[PDB]
């Protein structure tokens, strides 16, 4: 039933804030928490993401976390800022200096119990907690380091619940600091072990889409985030509205995750076009140029796939188009998981669109993204470059070595299953 949402660090709170703006709209909840929609579909499964207060107010079951008050002051000022439970803002002053170790071991260690207190209070009001979703980047310090610390601690206290993340991967094309590969590699290590599902959001990919497709000369974090929140709306549609397929976090995981470590998903959205038939959606959503992870699916194989169409359209035409892409490109789907492409339809489209499709792929191509971060990590680590920022926080080199090793292992695991035949 209920999901508990956490957002951590600058990136995490920025996409987190947009996500609530978007879905709050779809569910007809204005910034005061009041409902004003013209349908029951909106309020039928609203309890998955919103608590109910008196006056029929709806309050996001969301927890905002940062080691620095900057971004959370910005969110409290933003459009929907007043909607969040003010008690659910949890923040330090020191910041994390884009340093995983500070978020995970020092600055973050000091703040984490305050967060878990709010996490707990929110879980105790839940009729039947599904699990948690966290939004964050892997390239910084708070979202990356403290975010994964939160996840481990959450798992210790709720070991039989589902842990789901939206993780923004760093790219040189859109980079804040040189140590992003370090922070990301350290974080992936945690994710491989402690999440059930991770939507890999590649900033490289978001940029290429804003630039080459949307024809935006100067993509901004605002643009990048519009894509992300639209994707986030799409991938959670099944959890928020009436539906048979992947209707909750555990059923999604059972359908999408054949092997416990291989739970990194390549999302996609359509339409995306610069300044609309069911075939059009279907071709675009499967198009490499539409993937929010910078990987070529034609370089790997799909283990499993979920597709969510939204709006009024022909179910018959949906089924047809899907079965075509699938039966026409059947080489890219593994033969040893029969019928591994599942489709859902929801009648309510996102704001401003007649219809849209969201794609969620578990492709072995994803190894490209990890191999990329591993190459960047290794270029520096050979020379122990910039290590002092981390050893100065108590970390040892050996811990970097293990993270590297484990991520390299994950990559080898994806290759194994890319070569497997019936």
């Amino acid at each position: 039933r209920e999901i508990v949402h956490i957002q951590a660090g600058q990136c995490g709170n920025q996409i987190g804030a947009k996500f609530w703006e978007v879905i709050s709209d779809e569910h007809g909840i204005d910034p005061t928490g009041s409902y004003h929609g013209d349908s029951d579909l909106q309020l039928e499964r609203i309890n998955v993401y919103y608590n109910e207060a008196t006056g029929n107010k709806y309050v996001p079951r969301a927890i905002l976390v940062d080691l620095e008050p900057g971004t959370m002051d910005s969110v409290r000022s933003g459009p929907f800022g007043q909607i969040f439970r003010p008690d659910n803002f949890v923040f330090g002053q020191s910041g994390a200096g884009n340093n995983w170790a500070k978020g995970h071991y020092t600055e973050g260690a000091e703040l984490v119990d305050s967060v878990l207190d709010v996490v707990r209070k929110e879980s105790e009001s839940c009729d039947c907690l599904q699990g948690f979703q966290l939004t964050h980047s892997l390239g910084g310090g708070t979202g990356s380091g403290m975010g994964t610390l939160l996840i481990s601690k959450i798992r210790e206290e709720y070991p039989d619940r589902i842990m789901n993340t939206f993780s923004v991967m760093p790219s040189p094309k859109v980079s804040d600091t040189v140590v992003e590969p370090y922070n990301a590699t350290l974080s992936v290590h945690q994710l491989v072990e402690n999440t059930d599902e991770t939507y890999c959001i590649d900033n490289e990919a978001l940029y290429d889409i804003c630039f080459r497709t949307l024809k935006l000369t100067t993509p901004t974090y605002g643009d990048l985030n519009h894509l992300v929140s639209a994707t986030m709306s799409g991938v959670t549609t099944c959890l928020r509205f009436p539906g048979q397929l992947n209707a909750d976090l555990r059923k999604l995981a059972v359908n999408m995750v054949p092997f416990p470590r291989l739970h990194f998903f390549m999302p996609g959205f359509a339409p995306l076009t610069s300044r609309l038939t069911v075939p059009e959606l279907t071709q675009q959503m499967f198009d490499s140029k539409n993937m929010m992870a910078a990987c070529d699916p034609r370089h790997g194989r799909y283990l499993t796939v979920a597709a969510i169409f939204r709006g009024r359209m022909s179910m018959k035409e949906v089924d047809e188009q899907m079965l075509n892409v699938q039966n026409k490109n059947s080489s890219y789907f593994v033969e040893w998981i029969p019928n591994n492409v599942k489709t859902a339809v929801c009648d309510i489209p996102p704001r401003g669109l007649k219809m849209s499709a969201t794609f969620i792929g578990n492709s072995t191509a994803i190894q490209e993204l990890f191999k990329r971060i591993s190459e960047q990590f290794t270029a520096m680590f050979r020379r122990k470059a910039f290590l002092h920022w981390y050893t100065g926080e108590g970390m040892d080199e050996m811990e970097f070595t293990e993270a590297e090793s484990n991520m390299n292992d994950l990559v080898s695991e994806y290759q194994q299953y890319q070569d497997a035949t019936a």
Partner: protein, 303 residues
């Protein structure tokens, strides 16, 4: 585009059919075990018919009829003819097959050679040969002989049955002459005489023609055998569809009566005909079900 899989790498005929489908640029050959296929060119034995026609959105077609073995097994065929009222215990064009007959025939001097496989005049001689399942059928004894040579032969005809159960007789047949080309290879021919020439001989030596003296009977026999098992094997309203290529083997006696020897469910072809037949297969059996983008038939439709 269309997709197919190949599960009999030994089939001479369909090896050529796959070659043409590919050379159409509208057919993709998928891997042996990819189930998302339009067309299966199946394995000669233990074809998994049970798994056909259950792939949503795919029209599936296969190049064998389930149950057609009832015609293509020596022993099965005999049972079928004997016990099937429209073929009947007493059928004109099939040699008695399986003692009471051995008596009658060796009651008078008139008789009495029988061949057996899975030839002799003494029963016990090969009846012991067996034990040391088979069928015993009268060895025509009075074959029609070719001159020059004074030699025996047999006729092979190729029949394509499509998904609608239309019965198509390939206009080209061959005579295997002196009988198997495997035994013999171990006359301006190559031990293979075709219709152009054999019709001429018939006109020359017997003042008759191929159509009249022999082909009529062949058509009748083919139409009779296949109409008989139609209700058992037809895929008319089935969740998948079948077509299949058969080879019928005939013997002609000296009175120009045609005799059915057997039917093969997996026939080869005359080297020189592979081109024409195989193209016909893709035309009538495959392209009929899976049409392409944007004659003079080589087949005689039997009805």
């Amino acid at each position: 585009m269309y997709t197919f899989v190949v599960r009999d790498e030994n089939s001479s005929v369909y090896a050529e059919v796959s070659r043409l489908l590919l050379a159409t640029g509208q057919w993709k050959r998928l891997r042996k075990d990819n189930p998302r296929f339009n067309l299966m060119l199946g394995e000669r034995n233990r074809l998994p018919f049970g798994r056909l026609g259950h792939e949503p959105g795919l029209v599936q077609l296969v190049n064998y009829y389930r149950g057609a073995d009832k015609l293509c097994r020596k022993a099965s065929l005999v049972k079928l003819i004997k016990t099937s009222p429209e073929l009947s215990e007493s059928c004109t064009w099939f040699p008695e097959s399986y003692l009471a007959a051995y008596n009658r025939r060796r009651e008078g001097r008139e008789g009495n050679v029988w061949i057996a496989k899975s030839i002799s005049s003494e029963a016990s001689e090969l009846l012991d040969f067996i034990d040391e399942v088979h069928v015993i059928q009268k060895y025509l004894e009075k074959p029609l002989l070719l001159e020059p040579g004074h030699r025996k032969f047999d006729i092979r005809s190729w029949v394509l049955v499509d998904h609608l159960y239309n019965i198509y007789l390939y206009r080209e047949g061959v005579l295997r002459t002196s009988t198997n080309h495997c035994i013999q290879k171990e006359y301006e021919e190559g031990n293979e005489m075709f219709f152009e020439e054999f019709n001429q001989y018939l006109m020359d030596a017997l003042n008759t023609t191929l159509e009249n003296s022999i082909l009529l009977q062949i058509k009748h026999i083919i139409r009779s055998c296949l109409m008989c098992i139609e209700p058992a094997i037809s895929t008319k309203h089935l969740h998948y569809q079948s077509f299949q290529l058969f080879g019928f083997d005939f013997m002609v006696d000296e009175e120009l009566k045609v005799w059915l020897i057997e039917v093969n469910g997996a026939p080869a072809c005359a080297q020189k005909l592979y081109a024409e037949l195989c193209q016909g297969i893709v035309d009538v059996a495959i392209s009929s079900v899976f049409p392409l983008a944007d004659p003079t038939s080589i087949f005689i439709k039997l009805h």
